[PDB]
Write a protein that binds this ligand. Structure first.
Ligand code: UOL
Ligand code: UOL
Ligand code: UOL
Ligand code: UOL
Lengths: 264, 264, 264, 264
């Protein structure tokens, strides 16, 4: 079917891309980067995240595949030595699709500057634009805590092995439709109090961050960081949208975790 | 309907129990501790856990209610001052039922000593019977890590605010059908390696602990600790069974967490 | 002797300052903010830190005193209700001096842009100027680790109850001449490895951070954050300089910690 | 001079011991395990700790050396391949001595059962003898916190890379005369509160644990675990005694840490 290939842009990834395009030319495979049905990412997880964001508006029409030309990337299923096998298997259509949950972030502004919405495959984080970070954390309209510290991170299940992990979060199997909120260096004393623990939320729960004094925030979505001014609310919820992977063999999540953090 | 009341056994809980029995006598409420349909626990969370284990074989026929005579217990919905209101509301049948997931622990032995199975509302933990604790951790038959340290804790969602929390685990909303594995003081050096992070598993995943040298273990299920000798395997999975609570008003989990850890 | 008083600048602190100046006028106390021998800070710990930095070049000639007009500040020994008692005790010279260690930070530049040195009472932190933070950590010329993550924090003993604490550091009695290095969200996987644990260094050990790719860093010293470009090295060591407090009664550090974090 | 050699007791360590004894016989070296002046440990850190405790009453007359026949032990300076070089260097007296601090634990009993004192090279820990662990923590007679949880660990500087590290403690250079207290799974909620952070104490500070209800405790000193009944007090302080190592070359502590936890 229609496919496209993104490359990290080093010599190794560019050459692999050109060789895969040549292999696909031996099948009924049209290169089409406007409306692909298969998106192959050649690089690392950053390359994969960029491919995801390039096609975030057609996620229900696309199956993603990642090839890692460096160390095993987490969203990668293939080493470069297997590209020819992948071309063949993709050509014949011999693959199941697996879906991972995504995170929706809504940023609301004052002075009628509307809403912006973002989709995350790894996480969305929030920090101050300089000066202390203080937000009220509201869970399904329940005032839960006032957070003072460096920032907050809201992770998808597949993101839990990324920034979330470094912040002390739990690793969550991606079949669980959830998001996980972790703290970045909260202050805790007789006067300031947060929960400390990571929090795991199901689908349909809404976590709202509400400014207390300063209204300017640096908001990251995967590796894109943007300054938002005059923020009234940041709202997190598990997205109704999902990312779909083409799978050709068993590579269970927990084996992926083992291979990335324990030994490989 | 049929009900019974357990008491922590101090003067305050015993007297409240007797007064509630008197109130129930003004309605079509039969006291029956063999086959109750409502089980009221008066005490703390330990009292509640004991009531759960007293009726673990009739969990699908019973709705539980907890009254806390000391500090707000986590499984408690009522203060003692509200007992009369509770009697009335229970008598009229004005209540919805909510269910929390449970944890199944299976202990397999050698020399054909069969299997023992246990159900946990908070968690199941494992430690050595003395001497170093070393187990292989096998996830759905995938060898994931060799754990060396003080022990491991596998928590239900409602247990995540208990021992799990003290071990660095995430707090998980109990609508999520999952179990969470946390480490107790793992050794990590150039030679010994564990994941460190808490792990959250969905229903149908099986986590098996397999002895490496010593085969004797202290296994806790809620607050019951038992020595198991000649263990071949400890297996954890989310149970098919659930605990049911009678609910008469809104007391959302996240508000319960706020009230217990942030301020109340 | 010569004294001056700094104020947070709210009505309460300004009025207390004016009343203390009036009280001091009844003694042989000259107000002198060029060469004070006693520096009184009225406000919070931020006010105290600012007073310290205002006189960092005369630290061996000055004894500091802090009054907290809000919640108990850590560098505060007095509540506002005790100001008159403090005026009297200071006037008569009835006080011992206690010293806390300080942290020296040296920033070296390329293209012969020399060195800048800074003194910290709480801590010095380093983050990237945007983009990933990666430094080699060199301890007494021994390459110890390559750190990749959000940043690093080097704390004095009295700073260990501040940012250091939120980052998981140990609280250290200030009689110990040491500095403590904590991590901010390090990445750890099969490929990237850091020590994880806080590190405590004695006097005369030098910890050098050396850029790997990007050479621009945001360096904080207490609450002053500065962008440094074209950095070749950041060097941390326990300073030869000390801060001196005037003490009029026993307020042991561990009681101060209890009162600030446990109960008061 | 007088020396002795302890062995882990496997074939490799026993044979190395016999070969070193043969080498020492070519010098003015008397084997004497009653009053040695050099104690060589061949094995791992457990073997070294046992050698330390075998001669804890002559610590000021002995210099210790460790050979690791397995993975690099932390108290080991030599690989087995270097034994012959070590024999030679020891024979000629070409070595400096370095000292590490030690931990004194005093256990006081009721019903006039006196005091027991213990010396630790790694740490002393305390847990309940079964049933909940609850102690008041008193620092220099100041009531600091009531600890409820699994236990407490008090570490020497060289012990900070051992159990202390797994409990989240700081790694401390052994030139610092200090002890470090870490928590094992403390309960923290609206009702129960501990400091959480590791605490680092200088020489001459005394940390006293005082029972609240149960008076029976399991107390570990290095790898020796003993049940103490009817305890009135456990007291920790940095010992006046030190352990002395024979050093023949530079192996800095921080390089030792790097080699054990980062890469080697
Ligand atoms: C230390 C700076 N970051 C990196 O070096 N990331 C590159 C590494 O991260 C792995 N990586 C990525 C990525 C990716 C592409 N990133 C450039 C963006 C992502 O950087 C994460 N992030 C940011 N601050 C972090 C911090 N202080 N600590 C840890 N992470 C941090 C955050 O999740 C963001 O989205 N995604 C996954 C995943 N889902 N599971 C496991 N590993 C994964 C990938 O293979 C490479 O090993
Ligand atoms: C420190 C010793 N334990 C206690 O003082 N527990 C009594 C406290 O625990 C609260 N509690 C209980 C209980 C209950 C009844 N327990 C006697 C048994 C339970 O003790 C837990 N546990 C054991 N080791 C622990 C440790 N080192 N650190 C933290 N916990 C530890 C473990 O989950 C076990 O099942 N269940 C919940 C819950 N699901 N969510 C929130 N709080 C809860 C309850 O209100 C009281 O505040
Ligand atoms: C959360 C933002 N910071 C604050 O709200 N600080 C204000 C609080 O901090 C207390 N405070 C101060 C201060 C002070 C004055 N600061 C404006 C500057 C100091 O903010 C520290 N810092 C920065 N990022 C932090 C983070 N993410 N988490 C924790 N701290 C963080 C850092 O050490 C810096 O120097 N010094 C001490 C001390 N030595 N021991 C105990 N408490 C102390 C003081 O009473 C007030 O309770
Ligand atoms: C996990 C069980 N313990 C072990 O496997 N210890 C054997 C390991 O420990 C290294 N080891 C030893 C030892 C030694 C000899 N031990 C049998 C006794 C010591 O076991 C420590 N301990 C107990 N519970 C622990 C836990 N849950 N987590 C981490 N440690 C734990 C505790 O400090 C005790 O004294 N001393 C040092 C040192 N000062 N610095 C660095 N590594 C060191 C040594 O090379 C081997 O790699």
């Amino acid at each position: 079917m229609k496919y496209m290939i993104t490359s990290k842009g080093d010599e190794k990834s560019d050459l692999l891309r050109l060789n895969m395009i040549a292999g696909f030319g031996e099948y009924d495979m049209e290169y089409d980067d406007v409306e692909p049905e298969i998106v192959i990412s050649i690089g690392g997880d950053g390359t994969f995240l960029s491919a995801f964001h390039q096609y975030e508006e057609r996620l229900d029409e696309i199956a993603f595949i990642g090839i890692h030309t460096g160390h095993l990337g987490f969203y990668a299923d293939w080493r470069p030595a297997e590209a020819d096998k992948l071309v063949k298997l993709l050509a014949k259509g011999e693959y199941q699709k697996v879906s991972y949950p995504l995170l929706k972030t809504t940023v609301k502004y004052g002075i009628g500057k509307k809403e912006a919405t973002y989709l995350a495959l790894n996480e969305s984080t929030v920090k101050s634009s300089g000066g202390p970070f203080v937000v009220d954390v509201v869970i399904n309209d329940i005032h839960f805590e006032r957070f003072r510290g460096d920032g907050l991170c809201m992770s998808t299940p597949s993101g839990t092995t990324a920034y979330n992990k470094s912040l002390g979060g739990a690793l969550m199997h991606p079949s669980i439709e959830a998001m996980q909120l972790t703290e970045m260096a909260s202050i805790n004393n007789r006067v300031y109090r947060t929960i400390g623990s990571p929090l795991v939320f199901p689908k349909h729960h809404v976590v709202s961050l509400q400014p207390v004094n300063d209204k300017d925030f640096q908001i990251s979505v995967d590796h894109l960081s943007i300054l938002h001014r005059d923020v009234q609310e940041i709202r997190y919820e598990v997205s109704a949208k999902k990312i779909h992977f083409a799978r050709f063999r068993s590579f269970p999540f927990w084996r992926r975790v083992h291979d990335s953090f324990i030994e490989d």
